Subunit: 116 residues, 4 copies
């Protein structure tokens, strides 16, 4: 519930299904520790990444594997991935949705942050 | 169910709440006939605009009143509105989501079209 | 020089070349009167639309013929066109650039207003 | 000339001026080595990053320091930075422009790859 990812396809006008997403958290030593991962559903959504307990304050990186998606539709895209890096939960727990809209040579991302 | 509008605020990182939306349909005489209207909810969504019966084939215009939103947050924006114009249901009934992401000097829009 | 339009293609990663663009000014009776038009260049730009003398405060609509663009590339598009509607205000900077980034089911637009 | 970066501000409708940009090339051991950097100009552009000789095929990362930008304007931002990661491929056009459109909780990026 606290971290959700939504991915849309701007070419097809559809959810981007079966998109791999990897989440990292910056460790004390400044390396990126694996935090969670998953694949978007048939609605382009990925829930279930983490729990309120696990999702502590920190700097998080959400890596959306856009290059496998375009190639596994038969398209050679420009970007390797879309990376979204942000500090989370630094004034207490929030719920974050990271949304991404994909084209072969472009993407946009936005965050929706709500306080439960 | 067949036509939904979702509006997000890129400054606040939130749904864009209480955004007025007007939908028009192009008439035989090439004028824009009022079709439906409403306001986004606290989740930035507007459902209930039309029914499968009412939502026939045609050219539709979804006008999102972005200028009242920015001003009624105390911001003077650039655009008068965001207009999304498209042919609908021309190969049979589809479900359309029109999404818009707003900034004072910019917006983006995408469509998600699904076949029930 | 006061009004320029820049159009980009998010599918091919290129300027959107030979796109028709029509500019309208809102008239007293709430109708849209033709103001300027042209086709984007090889760099996706359209210059020469108006002059400082002609470009007075008011409500303008920039209609980009995205459907013809995508059709000419063999790609099925969603929108009839992209329309960007804005007020020109003399209290703000002098030169307006209307930029649009096109995909078949999506577009993005922004204004760069500079002195 | 082969690599340019353009940054725009969607809140103010202007170029994003004096934004720090760092470019990295991926090394054999999967680490990111510094390649080029600078600050955007008054037109939101950064030229002069590299030369044709230096800019070989590979994986590049363009990190835009969006958080400092927004802080200097007094605006609370979401992202630490914006990172654009791509492969340079010689089979495609010669000149790369990486464009980014910034908002406090969102950004858009596109590539314009031309000859
Ligand atoms: C939290 C975002 O959730 C959504 C949920 C349902 C449908 C769409 C979205 C969504 N739309 C956009 C959007 C992307 C590009 N241009 C305009 C809008 N980003 O996310
Ligand atoms: C003001 C002229 O604009 C430009 C001039 C030169 C090159 C590129 C651009 C440009 N990039 C974008 C853009 C839009 C949405 N997401 C990312 C980028 N819009 O315009």
């Amino acid at each position: 519930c606290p971290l959700m990812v939504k991915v849309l396809d701007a070419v097809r006008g559809s959810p981007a299904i079966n998109v791999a997403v990897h989440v990292f958290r910056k460790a004390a030593d400044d390396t990126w520790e694996p935090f969670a991962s998953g694949k978007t559903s048939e609605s382009g959504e990925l829930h279930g990444l983490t729990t309120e307990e696990e999702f502590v304050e920190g700097i998080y990186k959400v890596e959306i594997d856009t290059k496998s998606y375009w190639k596994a539709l038969g398209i050679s895209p420009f970007h390797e991935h879309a990376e979204v890096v942000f500090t989370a939960n630094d004034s207490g727990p929030r719920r974050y949705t990271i949304a991404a809209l994909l084209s072969p040579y472009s993407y946009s991302t936005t965050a929706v942050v709500t306080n439960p």
